[PDB]
Amino acid sequence: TTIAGVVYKDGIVLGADTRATEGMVVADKNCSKIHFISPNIYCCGAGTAADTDMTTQLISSNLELHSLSTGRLPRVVTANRMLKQMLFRYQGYIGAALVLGGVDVTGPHLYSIYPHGSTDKLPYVTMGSGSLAAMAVFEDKFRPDMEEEEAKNLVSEAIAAGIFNDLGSGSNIDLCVISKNKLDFLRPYTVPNKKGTRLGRYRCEKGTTAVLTEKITPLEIE
Amino acid sequence: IADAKTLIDKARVETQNHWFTYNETMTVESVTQAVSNLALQFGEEDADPGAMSRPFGVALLFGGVDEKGPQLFHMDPSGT
Amino acid sequence: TTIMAVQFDGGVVLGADSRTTTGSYIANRVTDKLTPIHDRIFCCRSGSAADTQAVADAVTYQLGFHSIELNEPPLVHTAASLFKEMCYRYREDLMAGIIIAGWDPQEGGQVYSVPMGGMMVRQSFAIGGSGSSYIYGYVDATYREGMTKEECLQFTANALALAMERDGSSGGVIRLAAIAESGVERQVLLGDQIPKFAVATL
Amino acid sequence: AGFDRHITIFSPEGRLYQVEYAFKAINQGGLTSVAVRGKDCAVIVTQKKVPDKLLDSSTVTHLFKITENIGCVMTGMTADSRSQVQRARYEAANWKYKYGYEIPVDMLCKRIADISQVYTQNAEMRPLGCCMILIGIDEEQGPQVYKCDPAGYYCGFKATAAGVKQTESTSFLEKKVKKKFDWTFEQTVETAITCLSTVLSIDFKPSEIEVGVVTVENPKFRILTEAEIDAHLVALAER
Amino acid sequence: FRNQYDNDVTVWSPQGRIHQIEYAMEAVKQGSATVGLKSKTHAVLVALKRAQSELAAHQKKILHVDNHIGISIAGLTADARLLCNFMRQECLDSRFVFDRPLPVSRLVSLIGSKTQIPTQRYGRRPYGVGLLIAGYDDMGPHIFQTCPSANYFDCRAMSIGARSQSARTYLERHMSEFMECNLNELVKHGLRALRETLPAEQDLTTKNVSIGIVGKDLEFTIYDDDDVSPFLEGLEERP
Amino acid sequence: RFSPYVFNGGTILAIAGEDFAIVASDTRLSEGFSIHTRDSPKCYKLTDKTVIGCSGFHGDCLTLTKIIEARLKMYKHSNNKAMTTGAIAAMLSTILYSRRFFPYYVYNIIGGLDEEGKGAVYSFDPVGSYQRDSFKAGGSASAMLQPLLDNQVGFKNMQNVEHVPLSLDRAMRLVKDVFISAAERDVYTGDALRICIVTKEGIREETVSLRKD
Amino acid sequence: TQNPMVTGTSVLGVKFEGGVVIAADMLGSYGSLARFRNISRIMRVNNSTMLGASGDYADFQYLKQVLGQMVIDEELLGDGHSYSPRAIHSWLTRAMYSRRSKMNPLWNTMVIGGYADGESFLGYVDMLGVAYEAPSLATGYGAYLAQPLLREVLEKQPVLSQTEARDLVERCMRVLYYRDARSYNRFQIATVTEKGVEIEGPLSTETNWDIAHMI
Amino acid sequence: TGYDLSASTFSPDGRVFQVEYAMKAVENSSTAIGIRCKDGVVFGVEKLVLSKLYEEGSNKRLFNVDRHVGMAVAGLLADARSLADIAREEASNFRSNFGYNIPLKHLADRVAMYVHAYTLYSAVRPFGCSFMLGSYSVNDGAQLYMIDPSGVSYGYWGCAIGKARQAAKTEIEKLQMKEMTCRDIVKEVAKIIYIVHDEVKDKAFELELSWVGELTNGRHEIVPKDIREEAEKYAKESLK
Amino acid sequence: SIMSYNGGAVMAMKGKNCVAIAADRRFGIQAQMVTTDFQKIFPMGDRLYIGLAGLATDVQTVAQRLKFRLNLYELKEGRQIKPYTLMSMVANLLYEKRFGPYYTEPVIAGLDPKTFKPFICSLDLIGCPMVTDDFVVSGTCAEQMYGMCESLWEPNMDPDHLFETISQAMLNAVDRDAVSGMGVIVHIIEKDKITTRTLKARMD
């Protein structure tokens, strides 16, 4: 897993890979590691996938209630505090490394949340197995007050560096741009690698497989 | 008869608890005090749910030979 | 990490490095370990980041409620006592070393040290964290009674620089704060501004 | 009847008379409070009556600070007022702890009011016989004024009063907003003081009233000194 | 009428009197009389026991809590037994924890708290028993009384139960000599005092008298029917 | 890491009689190789007719003595009589078994006079199994003391030797001698011996010196 | 405290005619580091009692707060009674034994010293709840080093004066400073008397390093 | 009218009458007064001697709720002793958690809230005690607070509770306590109590006094008997 | 691993307006087969199926608990569950026991109740849902069957071609593992019918 985020001049850009590995076999491709917490707050997740999914969903629901009651868009600090307090209560047994990104009345805020309840507000963050390579790219090429296209290019480069160099990561790249004005969620922004053409067709003709028994049960379409 | 059966059960279990703990036989006064303590609980000073709110509508006569010889004790709904 | 506080007449100077680490990877090189518990009470945080952040937010909550209901500025000893009760009651499950420093009108500038295990000591200067080991000698020799505010700032900067160069866990930029009756003046020393000392250079 | 004397039971007309009696409990105190909003400020005024000379005038107050940037004025039973003030302070601090930012005035009022609802629905406890009026500045919405009542109604207001002269005071304020030109800080304070003084007939002196203000320039709730109150009062008399 | 305001302890009366507590205080008057008096070196408890019938034995009116404390009861034997159990466990806890005899004043304070809790809450009745607590501690001999109301007193001498005013007036007129008395003189004085309470036809006997003595060298001992004969023989006759 | 026990040493002895019982113990408290104190008698007077001796972990000895004293008071209050030696023994068995799973590390000996007037000694394992015995030694020097008591008092393995009822004087002589030998050849036991003899008169305490280490 | 964190060593005490004296170094060591060098490891429980501790300083501070509130509340009820040193010692034995039974030990071993009713008291309490009374006491490495000297002088002289007892504890503190790494030069002395408790400030031991040149 | 039966109820005109009935409880009590001056706070109680049999220094209405604060009570003595236990618990908890002696204003607020809890619920009656609290600290200064059965709390330069509250209040009003010092204030407290005492209705009283201030180094304590005798003789002389 | 104790294999595949779900039949204790008729695919609807592989006990238990929840859902809401909603329900059930997990690796295969768009997904031990458009696999032989699927599968397959592909993949995969085999059953779900066939396989 590589997830990464950066703050550009008028918002945030979040990026992640789309590979899920159970052991050392790629259990899934085109997995979505960018989650919805609120209209203005999206969060990437890494670590235990179920923990990331469920904690992000729970905080999404709590912030939905909070925003409904207060009548104003949710703040990023509220999401950060909810997440960190839950994670601290569970003492790291729920395993989630999260890049929390959203824009609110204060401005653009990017937070990085560790499994034990630590949080860090930063201009740029990375998490997962490829965090070191992504951080290498960020440390090299991040500059303050970047434009949106520049930030997208940087995050794509970092997630790509994580993809190629790290084994656990690798698939299409996803991007998400949150601005004060708009949100653009970009399932595959880039497709760095593709499966090669199958030279030989092995399509099994009918009758290739023997069958001891069969039972056809008609369904009453209606 | 019913709350009498309850108090008789308390007396029996207390006698056997005394035998278990001290390897001896209770005195008639001690057994009568043991049941009397249960009878006192109608006041509901204890927070336990399983104590009858009404006083025990029975009087008992406890007769037994103890270290002091033959003894006859009377017990009443008050627990005196 | 290295955290250091020193008491000057009428206030305190707090100082800390910016490095937090996971193993040998510097997860954040720009961390802020000096947190406001209150307007004139700060804590220097050393140990587990999650533990320290949680306890700091809890003490901030409790001290704010206490301060508003008493309608008075809170006492640094009160904040330190809250920190002690938390850290001692959870000493087995908690890994934190805190230096509580601030200014209150009753007792002036105060520095309190909460090491791991939950005990409270008031100290004229206190050092904590992994890197404080290397600078115990420097603070013992260098410290003099009745230093000025600027003198204490330079002292804290030099000590933290020495600990930073000699400790891998410590590093980054030096974050310094001066708390007094007037208010908090926070500054960051980076690059050339950080004090540098000569190398053997054979 | 018997349909009163318990909060739970409904009347045959479905009115819950007990809470309506709690509303009377506010007027039993004999004090009035007024709150009026302005373009850049919100103010709360209330009578300060010291029955005995021996009482320390500093201690007696109906103006309390729920948090640094929110202030309230309580009208009704003094003890219930203090209890609700404590609950409000706890709610504000707990909001800051959980959500990382200062509680909005509207959400504080909503929390206190729904607590009052749980009081008016459960049997054994009684509604607190007090009324709260909260003033604060919200960055998005500017100044705010809100009121809780024993029932759980928490509506916001441009200006309001509570206490014995509530109807007279809101009649006075209704005329003033109808002839709306603006309210700066001085005019806001003057409107509040004129409303209270006119409805009571008091022609106040600085000791008799206590005023608290919030302003967009200085968001913190502050209770003005007797000197500031006299400065405003003299300006009223001069013109 | 005012049958209302008498139903429960939790209802104040229009003149600030909790009538159930007073009705409980009436309970002590029902019981047989008891007298307690002290000297510089000793504290004494003496009682008049009652019997349901000739065949029945006389009831136990003096109970030992500890070596250094013992009690005598007037009012409900049930409440007496319960409170005695509580006191005994408190003294045992003090000896286990601190390895010191519990101060008698502190013990009666604990009794007062435990007794007070029923009066304020709905539910359990007030303890309708009056106890005289007598003990020796490092400070000296002490005698206390506890009412069914949780208030307790410290006394030079006191008498509780039926017709105890006669004993109280005898004690008051003879009080000055008590302080320097021998234990025999003191028990004789107390015996005459309770003799005042008896009916004129009735007289003190070995059977209906129980005596309880504690002092610096003497642990609390209840002198029973046979053992009271040394103390009783000195007394002369009815006046 | 934390060990809830330490062996504070000491030995206890009890020897019954036709009309008497004796309970005797060292007065040394020793943690590891160091001597905490040289005057800490292990014998405690529960009643006029009973003495308890405890050896093992001193904290458990202390708490058990306090518990037994408190429950003795409670029995006195409830039943209006003093606990007999057998009653104390059974109560102690139950108390010890209460903590089967986090035990009291104590070896207890109860010595006293029974209701009939004869001497009785009750001996307890750490977990509360108890047996009436004519004599027994407990604690660190049980192995050393008990064989000689078996030979002299029980006349075991002795052929053509008459059996005499033990006397108070002979018993006290034997107790002093066996404790002297245990003082010689057991490191834990020494520096005094408190002999507590119970008769119809009551407890009588005599102290005799044993060699300091 | 399953693991001790900041610890102090070697509280000594000896009872003299008309009182008791206890003394303690002012160092709390963070595992071979002299982290805290002005901590006071002796407390004034009441006018008739003192207490000093070796082991985890945090546990000592907790016990200070608890026992001090206990002393305060008895003073508030104010019936003329007060806790004896025997009473404080018994309660402390109970508390330490309970925390041991809960396997949440208070790591400290404490000396309770007091003079009341004309009789001196000096008693030991361990983290496991082992407790006893004795003429002289030494905790930590004091038990191995200082206690022989105290026992020799006390065995030959059962009763000692305040002056010679003070000289004795000073000599034992000198020995412990020589032969214990966790010890410190500065130490306090505190004595209970008929008058009350007085704790002397930082006191220091003159040290003889003559054998160094002998080499 | 069933409105007065319970404290959960409200009268139709907005009055909780059980609380007022409890306020009538304290008026049954003998008077007690507390006066605050520059140096500190002085408390005084008119403790009626019901019987010669009762020991002196018994039925104490002046309690020490912490070393630096004292409490004087009027109303039901059982409820008062219980409230004193509550206040002592609150002070001890404050010391244990926040590390210093409780401020008197905060202590009054907490015990007042505890009292106010009882007026709300139907199961439990209001307290039958009104009590005064007083402390001196060099930081806070001299502080005197009074708590009614309702849970209302206020700071008083001078205060009175019990049967003779109004007369005691006018006598206190003509005193100028702010300038005065404690060793005079004890004498004037004795004067006021002797004035308000009714010899016909009340057979006899033993003046019970206490103070807190700088003269104690901020510890509430019972008056030394010499000073008590001097103040009592002065009060008898002034009474004429 | 504990998952290997009983052993199993479950597969699902997506064609055109059709789904196939297939699973082995062996039930055995670490090495000794007991029965060749274990049910590892259960019906959770008219044209929605779930397949459980892992511990046999947790297979049966989660199947029963899910049927409990699903029957109450269908009765309360008066409609058939959508496949994604069944996925979410199963994920909630498994995550409820995040500590002390049910040792299963479920696979859901079905057609949408109205669109009849095909749906396949898999869930991990602790309820991590993964939805795929080509195939999903679970069990001891995930590695082998993953490779075989990655080779054989083609998009927009006919029902007959889907049956041939899933049959070949399961047979060749379970041939190369010890603990699964003893026959395989293939369920083919089409909008108009359900076709269940038991293949001929090596009984070794």
mmCIF file with all atom_site columns, C-alpha atoms in Angstrom, chain B residues 2-80:
data_model
loop_
_atom_site.group_PDB
_atom_site.id
_atom_site.type_symbol
_atom_site.label_atom_id
_atom_site.label_alt_id
_atom_site.label_comp_id
_atom_site.label_asym_id
_atom_site.label_entity_id
_atom_site.label_seq_id
_atom_site.pdbx_PDB_ins_code
_atom_site.Cartn_x
_atom_site.Cartn_y
_atom_site.Cartn_z
_atom_site.occupancy
_atom_site.B_iso_or_equiv
_atom_site.pdbx_formal_charge
_atom_site.auth_seq_id
_atom_site.auth_comp_id
_atom_site.auth_asym_id
_atom_site.auth_atom_id
_atom_site.pdbx_PDB_model_num
ATOM 1  C CA . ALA B 1 2  ? -44.994 -21.153 53.573 1.00 0.00 ? 2  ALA B CA 1
ATOM 2  C CA . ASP B 1 3  ? -42.866 -18.511 55.265 1.00 0.00 ? 3  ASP B CA 1
ATOM 3  C CA . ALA B 1 4  ? -42.397 -21.048 58.059 1.00 0.00 ? 4  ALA B CA 1
ATOM 4  C CA . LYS B 1 5  ? -40.846 -23.372 55.470 1.00 0.00 ? 5  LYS B CA 1
ATOM 5  C CA . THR B 1 6  ? -38.597 -20.511 54.394 1.00 0.00 ? 6  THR B CA 1
ATOM 6  C CA . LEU B 1 7  ? -37.367 -19.877 57.936 1.00 0.00 ? 7  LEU B CA 1
ATOM 7  C CA . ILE B 1 8  ? -36.897 -23.603 58.585 1.00 0.00 ? 8  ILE B CA 1
ATOM 8  C CA . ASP B 1 9  ? -34.727 -23.775 55.466 1.00 0.00 ? 9  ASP B CA 1
ATOM 9  C CA . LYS B 1 10 ? -32.660 -20.849 56.747 1.00 0.00 ? 10 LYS B CA 1
ATOM 10 C CA . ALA B 1 11 ? -32.231 -22.587 60.105 1.00 0.00 ? 11 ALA B CA 1
ATOM 11 C CA . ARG B 1 12 ? -31.127 -25.859 58.521 1.00 0.00 ? 12 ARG B CA 1
ATOM 12 C CA . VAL B 1 13 ? -28.607 -24.266 56.164 1.00 0.00 ? 13 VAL B CA 1
ATOM 13 C CA . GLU B 1 14 ? -27.166 -22.149 58.975 1.00 0.00 ? 14 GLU B CA 1
ATOM 14 C CA . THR B 1 15 ? -26.722 -25.192 61.226 1.00 0.00 ? 15 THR B CA 1
ATOM 15 C CA . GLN B 1 16 ? -24.922 -27.051 58.464 1.00 0.00 ? 16 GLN B CA 1
ATOM 16 C CA . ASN B 1 17 ? -22.792 -24.003 57.625 1.00 0.00 ? 17 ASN B CA 1
ATOM 17 C CA . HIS B 1 18 ? -21.737 -23.863 61.268 1.00 0.00 ? 18 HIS B CA 1
ATOM 18 C CA . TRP B 1 19 ? -20.847 -27.552 61.167 1.00 0.00 ? 19 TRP B CA 1
ATOM 19 C CA . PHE B 1 20 ? -18.846 -27.005 57.979 1.00 0.00 ? 20 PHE B CA 1
ATOM 20 C CA . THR B 1 21 ? -16.930 -23.995 59.258 1.00 0.00 ? 21 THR B CA 1
ATOM 21 C CA . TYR B 1 22 ? -16.342 -24.840 62.948 1.00 0.00 ? 22 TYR B CA 1
ATOM 22 C CA . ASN B 1 23 ? -16.956 -28.629 63.193 1.00 0.00 ? 23 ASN B CA 1
ATOM 23 C CA . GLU B 1 24 ? -19.455 -28.168 66.013 1.00 0.00 ? 24 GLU B CA 1
ATOM 24 C CA . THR B 1 25 ? -23.174 -27.934 66.726 1.00 0.00 ? 25 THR B CA 1
ATOM 25 C CA . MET B 1 26 ? -24.916 -24.588 67.051 1.00 0.00 ? 26 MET B CA 1
ATOM 26 C CA . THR B 1 27 ? -26.667 -23.540 70.210 1.00 0.00 ? 27 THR B CA 1
ATOM 27 C CA . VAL B 1 28 ? -30.416 -23.058 70.180 1.00 0.00 ? 28 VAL B CA 1
ATOM 28 C CA . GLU B 1 29 ? -29.921 -19.352 70.881 1.00 0.00 ? 29 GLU B CA 1
ATOM 29 C CA . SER B 1 30 ? -27.533 -18.998 67.948 1.00 0.00 ? 30 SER B CA 1
ATOM 30 C CA . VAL B 1 31 ? -29.884 -20.798 65.550 1.00 0.00 ? 31 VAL B CA 1
ATOM 31 C CA . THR B 1 32 ? -32.801 -18.677 66.740 1.00 0.00 ? 32 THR B CA 1
ATOM 32 C CA . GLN B 1 33 ? -30.703 -15.553 66.205 1.00 0.00 ? 33 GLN B CA 1
ATOM 33 C CA . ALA B 1 34 ? -29.793 -16.781 62.726 1.00 0.00 ? 34 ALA B CA 1
ATOM 34 C CA . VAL B 1 35 ? -33.422 -17.133 61.675 1.00 0.00 ? 35 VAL B CA 1
ATOM 35 C CA . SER B 1 36 ? -34.272 -13.896 63.504 1.00 0.00 ? 36 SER B CA 1
ATOM 36 C CA . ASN B 1 37 ? -31.766 -11.988 61.384 1.00 0.00 ? 37 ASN B CA 1
ATOM 37 C CA . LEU B 1 38 ? -33.605 -13.212 58.292 1.00 0.00 ? 38 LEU B CA 1
ATOM 38 C CA . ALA B 1 39 ? -36.933 -12.203 59.833 1.00 0.00 ? 39 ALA B CA 1
ATOM 39 C CA . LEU B 1 40 ? -35.553 -8.719  60.522 1.00 0.00 ? 40 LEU B CA 1
ATOM 40 C CA . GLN B 1 41 ? -34.955 -8.156  56.795 1.00 0.00 ? 41 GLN B CA 1
ATOM 41 C CA . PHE B 1 42 ? -38.575 -7.116  56.137 1.00 0.00 ? 42 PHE B CA 1
ATOM 42 C CA . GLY B 1 43 ? -37.339 -3.608  56.959 1.00 0.00 ? 43 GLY B CA 1
ATOM 43 C CA . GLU B 1 44 ? -35.503 -3.719  53.611 1.00 0.00 ? 44 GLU B CA 1
ATOM 44 C CA . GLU B 1 45 ? -32.331 -2.074  54.915 1.00 0.00 ? 45 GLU B CA 1
ATOM 45 C CA . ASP B 1 46 ? -30.499 -4.422  52.549 1.00 0.00 ? 46 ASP B CA 1
ATOM 46 C CA . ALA B 1 47 ? -30.675 -3.688  48.823 1.00 0.00 ? 47 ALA B CA 1
ATOM 47 C CA . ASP B 1 48 ? -31.185 -7.339  47.836 1.00 0.00 ? 48 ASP B CA 1
ATOM 48 C CA . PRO B 1 49 ? -34.376 -7.883  45.780 1.00 0.00 ? 49 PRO B CA 1
ATOM 49 C CA . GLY B 1 50 ? -35.049 -11.353 47.179 1.00 0.00 ? 50 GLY B CA 1
ATOM 50 C CA . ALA B 1 51 ? -36.329 -10.383 50.621 1.00 0.00 ? 51 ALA B CA 1
ATOM 51 C CA . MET B 1 52 ? -40.053 -10.355 51.344 1.00 0.00 ? 52 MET B CA 1
ATOM 52 C CA . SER B 1 53 ? -41.324 -6.851  52.040 1.00 0.00 ? 53 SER B CA 1
ATOM 53 C CA . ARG B 1 54 ? -43.928 -8.107  54.496 1.00 0.00 ? 54 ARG B CA 1
ATOM 54 C CA . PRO B 1 55 ? -42.856 -9.411  57.912 1.00 0.00 ? 55 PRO B CA 1
ATOM 55 C CA . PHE B 1 56 ? -42.803 -13.161 58.327 1.00 0.00 ? 56 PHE B CA 1
ATOM 56 C CA . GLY B 1 57 ? -46.269 -14.125 59.512 1.00 0.00 ? 57 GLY B CA 1
ATOM 57 C CA . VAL B 1 58 ? -45.148 -16.996 61.698 1.00 0.00 ? 58 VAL B CA 1
ATOM 58 C CA . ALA B 1 59 ? -43.959 -17.697 65.225 1.00 0.00 ? 59 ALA B CA 1
ATOM 59 C CA . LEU B 1 60 ? -41.478 -20.476 65.925 1.00 0.00 ? 60 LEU B CA 1
ATOM 60 C CA . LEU B 1 61 ? -40.581 -22.444 69.029 1.00 0.00 ? 61 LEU B CA 1
ATOM 61 C CA . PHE B 1 62 ? -36.983 -23.654 69.019 1.00 0.00 ? 62 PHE B CA 1
ATOM 62 C CA . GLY B 1 63 ? -36.305 -26.527 71.389 1.00 0.00 ? 63 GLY B CA 1
ATOM 63 C CA . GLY B 1 64 ? -32.955 -28.229 71.675 1.00 0.00 ? 64 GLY B CA 1
ATOM 64 C CA . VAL B 1 65 ? -30.343 -29.568 74.047 1.00 0.00 ? 65 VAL B CA 1
ATOM 65 C CA . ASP B 1 66 ? -27.113 -27.556 73.916 1.00 0.00 ? 66 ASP B CA 1
ATOM 66 C CA . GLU B 1 67 ? -24.024 -27.017 76.071 1.00 0.00 ? 67 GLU B CA 1
ATOM 67 C CA . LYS B 1 68 ? -26.377 -25.311 78.554 1.00 0.00 ? 68 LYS B CA 1
ATOM 68 C CA . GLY B 1 69 ? -28.793 -28.262 78.532 1.00 0.00 ? 69 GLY B CA 1
ATOM 69 C CA . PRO B 1 70 ? -32.435 -28.230 77.446 1.00 0.00 ? 70 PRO B CA 1
ATOM 70 C CA . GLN B 1 71 ? -33.444 -24.836 76.101 1.00 0.00 ? 71 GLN B CA 1
ATOM 71 C CA . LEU B 1 72 ? -36.675 -23.531 74.594 1.00 0.00 ? 72 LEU B CA 1
ATOM 72 C CA . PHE B 1 73 ? -36.577 -20.326 72.563 1.00 0.00 ? 73 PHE B CA 1
ATOM 73 C CA . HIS B 1 74 ? -39.526 -18.402 71.157 1.00 0.00 ? 74 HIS B CA 1
ATOM 74 C CA . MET B 1 75 ? -39.422 -16.416 67.930 1.00 0.00 ? 75 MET B CA 1
ATOM 75 C CA . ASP B 1 76 ? -42.030 -13.993 66.605 1.00 0.00 ? 76 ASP B CA 1
ATOM 76 C CA . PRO B 1 77 ? -42.712 -12.059 63.383 1.00 0.00 ? 77 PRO B CA 1
ATOM 77 C CA . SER B 1 78 ? -40.713 -9.101  64.714 1.00 0.00 ? 78 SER B CA 1
ATOM 78 C CA . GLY B 1 79 ? -37.614 -11.285 64.892 1.00 0.00 ? 79 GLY B CA 1
ATOM 79 C CA . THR B 1 80 ? -37.316 -10.830 68.639 1.00 0.00 ? 80 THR B CA 1
#
